[PDB]
A paper describes a structure:
Herein we report the first X-ray crystal structures of mixed chirality α-helices in short peptides comprising only natural residues as the example of a stapled bicyclic and a linear membrane disruptive amphiphilic antimicrobial peptide (AMP) containing seven l- and four d-residues, as complexes of fucosylated analogs with the bacterial lectin LecB. The mixed chirality α-helices are superimposable onto the homochiral α-helices and form under similar conditions as shown by CD spectra and MD simulations but non-hemolytic and resistant to proteolysis. To get a direct insight into the structure of AMBP bp65/bp69 and their linear analogs ln65/ln69, we performed several crystallization studies using either the compounds themselves or their racemates to be crystallized as pure compounds, or their fucosylated derivatives of both mirror image peptides as complexes with the P. aeruginosa lectin LecB. These direct observations unequivocally demonstrate that the α-helical fold with only natural residues can sometimes tolerate multiple stereochemical inversions without significant conformational changes.
In all four individually resolved homochiral bicyclic structures, the peptides were present in almost perfectly superimposable conformations featuring nine of the eleven residues forming two full turns of a right-handed α-helix including the pair of stapling cysteines (ESI†). The two N-terminal residues and the N-terminal toluoyl double staple formed a turn conformation. In all four cases the α-helical fold resulted in an amphiphilic arrangement of hydrophobic and cationic residues corresponding to the helix-wheel model and explaining the membrane disruptive activities discussed above. Remarkably, the ten crystallographically non-equivalent stapled bicyclic α-helices observed in the X-ray structures of the homochiral rac-bp65 and bp70, and the mixed chirality bp71·LecB complex were essentially superimposable, with RMSD < 0.6 Å for the peptide backbones.
Numbering used by the authors: 2 to 12
């Protein structure tokens, strides 16, 4: 939703 959120998600 938040690109910071996004990255976490694939991290």
């Amino acid at each position: 939703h938040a690109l910071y959120a996004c990255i976490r998600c694939y991290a």
